[PDB]
């Protein structure tokens, strides 16, 4: 599924991401935009043998288990295959644990490259929330 900007902002607000651990809603919408382009099916294999899954590109080496990645830790204790639903529930629950580490949203490379430092609030502007 491919969310519309405002559609996801409302979904993420409902899923408790507005001001979660110091990160405003715009951060998450912007992150989804550049990590998966709002696509819940996004799947990208990496150089280190891992793969990023879902709307928020959760990594198989640290967060979810895909059973084919070297040195898997599965911190979110969930199969990567379970993070590809149209229902963002599972990716949000895992995203919250990820950002609860001292590294915060820096875990999301695209967010770090395209959102951090920008007017993230712009991503929720012009939306009914």
């Amino acid at each position, epitope marked *: 599924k491919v969310f519309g900007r405002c559609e996801l902002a409302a979904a993420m*607000k*409902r*899923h*408790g*991401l*507005d*001001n*979660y*651990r*110091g990160y405003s809603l715009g951060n998450w919408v912007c992150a989804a935009k550049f990590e998966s382009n709002f696509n819940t099916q996004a799947t990208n294999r990496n150089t280190d043998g891992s793969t990023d899954y879902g709307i928020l590109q959760i990594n198989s080496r*640290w967060w979810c288990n895909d059973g084919r990645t070297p040195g898997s*830790r*599965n*911190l979110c*204790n969930i199969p990567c295959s379970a993070l590809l639903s149209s229902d963002i529930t599972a990716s949000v*629950n895992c995203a*919250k*644990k990820i950002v*609860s*580490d*001292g*590294n915060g949203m820096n875990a999301w490379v695209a967010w770090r490259n395209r959102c951090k430092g920008t007017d993230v609030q712009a991503w929720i502007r012009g939306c009914r929330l």
Partner: antibody, heavy 113, light 107 residues
Framework: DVQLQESGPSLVKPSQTLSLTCSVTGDSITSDYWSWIRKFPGNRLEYMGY???????YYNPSLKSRISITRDTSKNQYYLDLNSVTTEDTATYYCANWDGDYWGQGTLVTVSA | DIVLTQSPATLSVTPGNSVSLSCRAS??????LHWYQQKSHESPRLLIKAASQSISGIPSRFSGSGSGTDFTLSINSVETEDFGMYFC?????????FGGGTKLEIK
């Protein structure tokens, strides 16, 4: 299955450092975030802090920077240090994983002269 | 810090009746509220996470609802084993905080 178990002295002196150990069985500590919570006499619960995978820590400001949470992978356990304790630190200490699915049995630590 | 208020702090009920416990936060916490049950002499037991998400192994009669600053833990047909303390905890902002707790007592 995963099991948590606190251990350490139950009686400590004022001004000393209170230290406890949480032994994790059933899985590796490298697969979760780990916290310490304590309950005071009166049904008052206080979240002390936790250590995440990167080793970064978050401590409750109420502890006034007297707390330290560390880990030891080879022993599959993590620890709690609370410096310069006072009778105000007497409570039941529990270790639990970050999301709260697993809790230790809790251990009463009394601070007395 | 975020202050969680659980009022009434004590609730008297007859087994079989349905009750709701309140937890209000001093500032919005989205859906980041967890409900715990703590029977005397025992470690807390997580009943509901993320305000309304069910937990495997927990009786079905327990459910949670709410968002923002007002949350509710609902018990459908209270059982004797349910008597005890119930605490809500927020994880939206650090430091994580607990409500003062609500004690479920028989009439």
């Amino acid at each position: 299955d995963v099991q948590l178990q606190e251990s350490g002295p139950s009686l400590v002196k004022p001004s000393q450092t209170l230290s406890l150990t949480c032994s994790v069985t059933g899985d590796s500590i490298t697969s979760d975030y780990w916290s310490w919570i304590r309950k005071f006499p009166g049904n008052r619960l206080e979240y002390m802090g936790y250590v995440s995978y990167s080793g970064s820590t978050y401590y409750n400001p109420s502890l006034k920077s007297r707390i330290s949470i560390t880990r030891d992978t080879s022993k599959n356990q993590y620890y709690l240090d609370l410096n310069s304790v006072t009778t105000e630190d007497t409570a039941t200490y529990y270790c639990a994983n970050w999301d709260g699915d697993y809790w230790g049995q809790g251990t009463l630590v009394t601070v007395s002269a | 810090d975020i202050v969680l208020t659980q009022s009434p702090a004590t609730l008297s009920v007859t087994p079989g009746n349905s009750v709701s416990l309140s937890c209000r936060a001093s500032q919005s916490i989205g859906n980041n509220l967890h409900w715990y049950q703590q029977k005397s002499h025992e470690s807390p037991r997580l009943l509901i996470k993320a305000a309304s998400q069910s937990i495997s192994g927990i009786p079905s009669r327990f459910s949670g609802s709410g968002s923002g600053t007002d949350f509710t833990l609902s018990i459908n047909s209270v059982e004797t084993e349910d008597f005890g303390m119930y605490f809500c905890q927020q994880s939206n902002s650090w430091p994580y905080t607990f409500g003062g707790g609500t004690k479920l007592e028989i009439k």
